[PDB]
């Protein structure tokens, strides 16, 4: 076949029930995953060519970074309370990878306060158990996959994307690849 499994995708032997539609995980610290958002705008992509009343779900995970990567989940935790995560995601992955401005959860903060949410508003939520609930729920989503690498999607609890399987010598032919293969799984 032209998509065959173990080359653009591979299958959990252990699916999962009632996940996501689209399912990413990311993490701040993630080099590939700050490629993924300002260079290739891969959510971006697959967004457009997947149907509407297709919901596309983005997690952070813990393995990365130690105690600030745990702080970053919870801080992508009031991203997703608030709405703010066209806001917070370049600086966040700036301050990390390219500033490296980020050292505490003081500096994490700073980056929403810049991104114009208040002082007041943020802290809040960062102390909410519907944060709380918010982190949970992207540590069980990690949990239900055994997830040891990202970036990482799944389509419907079932597929995994295989970027490694793609041609990388065109960064928009890879992107397009990508998300039609995430269109392909989506179908299936």
């Not at 114009?116 to 960062?126: L, N, P, Q, T």
Request: hydrophobic residues 40%; glycine residues 6%.
């Amino acid at each position: 076949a032209q998509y065959e499994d173990g080359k653009q995708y591979t299958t959990l032997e252990k699916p999962v029930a009632g996940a996501p539609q689209v399912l990413e995980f990311f993490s701040f610290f993630c080099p590939h995953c700050y490629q993924f958002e300002e260079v290739l705008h891969i959510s971006d992509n697959v967004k457009k060519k997947l149907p509407e009343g297709v919901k596309m779900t983005k997690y952070h995970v813990n393995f990365m970074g130690g105690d600030l990567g745990k702080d970053l989940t919870q801080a992508w935790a009031v991203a997703m309370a608030l709405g703010v995560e066209d806001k917070v995601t370049v600086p966040l992955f700036e301050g990390v990878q390219k500033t490296q401005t980020i050292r505490s959860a003081s500096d994490i903060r700073d980056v929403f306060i810049n991104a114009g949410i208040k002082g007041e508003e943020y802290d809040a939520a960062w102390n909410s158990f519907v944060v709380k609930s918010l982190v949970a729920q992207q540590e069980k989503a990690a949990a239900d996959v055994q997830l040891r690498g990202v970036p990482a999607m799944f389509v419907n609890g079932k597929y995994q994307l295989n970027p490694q399987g793609m041609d990388t010598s065109n960064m928009d032919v890879f992107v397009q690849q990508y998300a039609d293969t995430v269109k392909y799984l989506s179908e299936k």
